[PDB]
Amino acid sequence: APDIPLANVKAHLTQLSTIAANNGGNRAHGRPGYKASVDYVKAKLDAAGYTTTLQQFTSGGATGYNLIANWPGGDPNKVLMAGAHLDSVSSGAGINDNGSGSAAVLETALAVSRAGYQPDKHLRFAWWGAEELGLIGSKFYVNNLPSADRSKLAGYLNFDMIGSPNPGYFVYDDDPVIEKTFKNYFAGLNVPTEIETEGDGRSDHAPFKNVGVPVGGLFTGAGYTKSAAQAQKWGGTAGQAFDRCYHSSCDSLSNINDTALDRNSDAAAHAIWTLSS
Ligand code: MED
Ligand SMILES: [Ca+2]
Ligand SMILES: [Zn+2]
Ligand SMILES: [Zn+2]
């Protein structure tokens, strides 16, 4: 897999920050900052050769969108998906939650095109709307995915909060092959990982997991406090939240740990390459 350039991931975050500023301070469902975020991500993917779909839904009386991007080619019967919710809460720009995952998935998708990669499995990326309303966009996608297509899914990889400023390195303990692939990447860096427990089912992998699609993912922690043992293994500040700006107006460009964002973006690309061969 290629390295994912940290600077490129950061640049997507800068664009999402500007989009929030230009649209009332947020990128929330039903608010213009969300659709503007969609439009930015879609234009990059379209230019790189993806077949994109804007999947519309209505929730709370307002139109929402999922952005689906299919890389042409690969076995239609073995589809590997990766995704990240693209909405924020309305209090702020949602740069760690979840600009970070959205930007890593976008830069990985662009990396596939730059590398001229032809995965054996068909790749499909997704940016979900309205996750902050209760996984509404990913539930909509799974609920509207025919059973014949659901059975073609080899896996769904989720990236939701991967740049926390006081990070942990959490890997979902779900499908064994997906989990092993992420933990192998971190082992190559000599960075230990822990099982994800803080967020559990509270992200867009849940609708997939609940219908038997193998899932996995990466997370760097939210409002829980980093323990003494976690600060010893990862650095940072024991006794402070992983993300002191969770769901806050201060979830801005200053609310990112560059090392965590880099490591998790690189691990996302590593897993996508390994699991699509
Ligand atoms: C990764 S599970 C934590 C859920 C948090 N991202 C949220 O979007 O509210
Ligand atoms: Ca990198
Ligand atoms: Zn999130
Ligand atoms: Zn959130």
170 forms bridges with which residues in the sheet? 194, 219
C-alpha torsion angle, residues 161, 124, 206, 87 (rounded to 10): 50
Ligand nearest to the CA of 98: 3
Q: Establish whether residue 131 lines the binding site of ligand 1, counting it when its CB lies within 6 angstroms of any ligand atom.
A: yes
Residue 232: other Cβ atoms inside 10 A: 9
* Residue 76 burial class via C-beta count within 10 angstroms: exposed 0-12, middle 13-18, buried 19 and up: exposed
Q: Establish whether residue 87 lines the binding site of ligand 1, counting it when its CB lies within 6 angstroms of any ligand atom.
A: no
Nearest ligand 1 atom to the CA of 200 is 2
Alpha-carbon distance of 141 to 144, in angstroms, equals 5
Residue with tokens 């980093």: 226
**72, two tokens:** 């042409």
Cα-Cα-Cα-Cα dihedral sign, residues 18, 22, 24, 28: negative
List, in order, residues 6 or more apart from 232 with CB less than 8 Å away: none
Helix (H) or strand (E) holding 95: none
Between the CA of 85 and the centroid of ligand 3 the distance, in Å, is 6
What values do phi and psi take at 228, rounded to 5? Answer: -55, -45
- Give yes or no: 194 in active site: no
Q: Establish whether residue 222 lines the binding site of ligand 1, counting it when its CB lies within 6 angstroms of any ligand atom.
A: yes
Q: Establish whether residue 94 lines the binding site of ligand 1, counting it when its CB lies within 6 angstroms of any ligand atom.
A: no
Q: Establish whether residue 134 lines the binding site of ligand 1, counting it when its CB lies within 6 angstroms of any ligand atom.
A: no
Q: Establish whether residue 128 lines the binding site of ligand 1, counting it when its CB lies within 6 angstroms of any ligand atom.
A: no
The amino acid present at 171, given as its one-letter code, is V
- Which residue ranges are tagged as binding site for Zn(2+)? 85, 97, 132, 160, 247
User: Which of 97, 205, 218 to mutate to test ligand 1, by most ligand atoms within 8 A of the CB atom?
Assistant: 97
Assigned superfamily of 1-277 = Zn peptidases (3.40.630.10)
Between the CA of 219 and the centroid of ligand 4 the distance, in Å, is 12
Alpha-carbon distance of 83 to 77, in angstroms, equals 19
85 forms bridges with which residues in the sheet? 128
Ligand nearest to the CA of 5: 2
- What separation in angstroms does the CA of 16 have from each of 40, 193, 247? 8, 29, 16
- Quick one: which of 218, 158, 209, 233 has its CA closest to 183? 218
**65, two tokens:** 């969108």
Alpha-carbon distance of 129 to 115, in angstroms, equals 29
Between the CA of 229 and the centroid of ligand 4 the distance, in Å, is 26
Domain boundaries, the chain: 1-277
List, in order, residues 6 or more apart from 114 with CB less than 8 Å away: 2, 48
CB 82 within 8 A of CB 119: no
How big is the CA angle at 9 (ends 94 and 254), to the nearest 5 degrees? Answer: 45
Q: What residue owns the CA closest to ligand 1's atom 9? A: 132
Alpha-carbon distance of 275 to 155, in angstroms, equals 9
Q: Using what technique was this structure determined?
A: X-ray
- What separation in angstroms does the CA of 182 have from each of 100, 115, 163, 272? 17, 21, 16, 10
Question: Which one-letter DSSP state was computed for residue 218?
Answer: E
Taking only Cα atoms into account, the Rg of the chain, rounded to an integer number of angstroms, comes to 17
Strands, E assignment, the chain: 51-59, 62-70, 75-85, 121-128, 153-159, 170-171, 194-195, 215-219
- Quick one: which of 86, 117, 123 has its CA closest to 12? 86
| Residue 259 DSSP SS3 | helix
66 forms bridges with which residues in the sheet? 55
| Residue 64 DSSP SS3 | strand
The amino acid present at 223, given as its one-letter code, is G
What values do phi and psi take at 125, rounded to 5? Answer: -110, 155
* Residue 10 burial class via C-beta count within 10 angstroms: exposed 0-12, middle 13-18, buried 19 and up: buried
Between the CA of 4 and the centroid of ligand 2 the distance, in Å, is 4
CB-facing half-sphere around the CA of 234: CA atoms within 13 A: 27
Alpha-carbon distance of 191 to 85, in angstroms, equals 26
Residue with tokens 């309303």: 133
* Residue 245 burial class via C-beta count within 10 angstroms: exposed 0-12, middle 13-18, buried 19 and up: buried
Q: State the chain's maximal CA–CA distance in angstroms.
A: 48
**Is the backbone of residue 161 left (phi > 0), alpha (psi -120 to 50) or beta?**
left
